[PDB]
Scaffold this active site. Sequence first.
Site, short mmCIF file in Angstrom:
data_model
loop_
_atom_site.label_atom_id
_atom_site.label_comp_id
_atom_site.label_asym_id
_atom_site.label_seq_id
_atom_site.Cartn_x
_atom_site.Cartn_y
_atom_site.Cartn_z
CD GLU A 6 76.75 -37.88 104.88
OE1 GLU A 6 76.84 -36.42 105.04
OE2 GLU A 6 77.10 -38.34 103.99
CG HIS A 52 71.16 -38.88 96.05
ND1 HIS A 52 71.57 -38.13 97.16
CD2 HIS A 52 71.30 -38.74 95.19
CE1 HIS A 52 71.90 -36.77 96.88
NE2 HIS A 52 71.30 -36.76 95.64
CB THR A 61 78.39 -34.46 102.94
OG1 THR A 61 77.00 -34.78 102.97
CG2 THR A 61 78.73 -33.81 104.03
CG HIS A 117 73.50 -38.30 104.76
ND1 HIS A 117 73.84 -38.41 103.24
CD2 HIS A 117 73.10 -37.09 105.38
CE1 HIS A 117 73.83 -37.08 102.80
NE2 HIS A 117 73.66 -36.53 103.88
CG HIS A 132 69.22 -34.39 103.64
ND1 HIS A 132 69.47 -33.06 102.91
CD2 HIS A 132 70.48 -35.11 103.52
CE1 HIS A 132 71.00 -33.30 103.13
NE2 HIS A 132 71.21 -34.44 103.29
CG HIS A 175 73.25 -33.46 107.23
ND1 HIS A 175 74.14 -34.33 105.91
CD2 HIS A 175 73.43 -33.92 108.25
CE1 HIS A 175 74.63 -34.55 106.90
NE2 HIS A 175 74.49 -34.04 108.02
C1 LIG Z 1 69.93 -34.19 99.39
C2 LIG Z 1 71.40 -33.64 99.31
C3 LIG Z 1 71.85 -34.35 100.80
O1 LIG Z 1 71.02 -33.68 97.82
C4 LIG Z 1 72.91 -32.62 98.44
C5 LIG Z 1 72.98 -31.60 96.86
O2 LIG Z 1 73.86 -30.84 97.45
S1 LIG Z 1 73.86 -29.27 96.25
O3 LIG Z 1 73.63 -27.80 97.15
O4 LIG Z 1 74.67 -29.31 96.06
O5 LIG Z 1 72.09 -29.61 95.97
C6 LIG Z 1 71.61 -30.45 96.57
C7 LIG Z 1 70.65 -30.61 98.18
O6 LIG Z 1 71.48 -30.20 99.26
C8 LIG Z 1 72.50 -31.47 99.70
C9 LIG Z 1 72.97 -30.74 100.64
O7 LIG Z 1 73.91 -31.93 100.99
S2 LIG Z 1 74.31 -31.69 102.85
N1 LIG Z 1 74.77 -33.09 102.70
O8 LIG Z 1 75.63 -31.54 102.51
O9 LIG Z 1 73.64 -31.47 103.99
O10 LIG Z 1 71.04 -31.78 100.03
ZN LIG Z 2 73.65 -34.47 104.04
#
Ligand SMILES: CC1(C)O[C@H]2[C@@H]3OS(=O)(=O)O[C@@H]3CO[C@@]2(COS(N)(=O)=O)O1
Ligand SMILES: [Zn+2]
Length: 258
Positions: free
Chosen positions: A104, A62, A196, A94, A92, A117
């Site tokens: 976002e 994603h 997110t 978006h 990463h 982010h």
């Molecule tokens: C790669 C991406 C977008 O996936 C998400 C998943 O959330 S999580 O805490 O369960 O672990 C993964 C890694 O962290 C994230 C955090 O994304 S974000 N958009 O909230 O900054 O980054």
């Molecule tokens: Zn993100």
Amino acid sequence: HHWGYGKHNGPEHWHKDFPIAKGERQSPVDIDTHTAKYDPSLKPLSVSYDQATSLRILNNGHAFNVEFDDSQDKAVLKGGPLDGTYRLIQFHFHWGSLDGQGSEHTVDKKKYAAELHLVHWNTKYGDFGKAVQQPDGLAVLGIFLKVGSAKPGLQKVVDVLDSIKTKGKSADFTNFDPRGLLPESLDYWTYPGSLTTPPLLECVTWIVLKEPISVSSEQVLKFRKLNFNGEGEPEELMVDNWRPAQPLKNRQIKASFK
Ligand SMILES: CC1(C)O[C@H]2[C@@H]3OS(=O)(=O)O[C@@H]3CO[C@@]2(COS(N)(=O)=O)O1
Ligand SMILES: [Zn+2]
């Protein structure tokens, strides 16, 4: 094959498997510049990436993640609304299918072409996995992207995308300096929110920089050539992998600047 960004598995569907999606502190949100209030109790923001150690870039289906060695306080974020030290684990983006959408968070309802982010976890909790189970477990630094001149510091990222087009692919990405992706000013807006993407845990302190960085059309277009799908499967261009603005509910967005 769980959640995604399509018609049948996108953001409006997530709540089914992740009820918190309709919670009290969900992200992203629209940032009302006129309503956000200057908070004098905010401490100066501190981004220390001089010793950051990048390791590898991965297409996770994603988005793509540029991972960092976080076994030590090599690159950290402190100050601002945060107490304690938050370790950088990965960054990463978006982005959209077109320049008019992709970010976002939004500013006065305006959508940017993309949003960077930089994810950090509160070292007081030991590891990323335990931090996400805490209200102040993560600190995510958001930086908007607008299309204009190219961002030199982003090209090394752009050039390697050819090698990780499909889901599951990764490539060595050592010696990359994330300081090359920051705008000049550190002015920002902050509020308590969440991840997110599912599991949408409400464990994040969001810090969104007011000043966007400029990237070239050529640069963004390369982001849009990545695939959501794995190798050998019908092509599903990786675009519009952003969750729309959520209700602000009982929250106040504070500004670091007068
Ligand atoms: C790669 C991406 C977008 O996936 C998400 C998943 O959330 S999580 O805490 O369960 O672990 C993964 C890694 O962290 C994230 C955090 O994304 S974000 N958009 O909230 O900054 O980054
Ligand atoms: Zn993100």
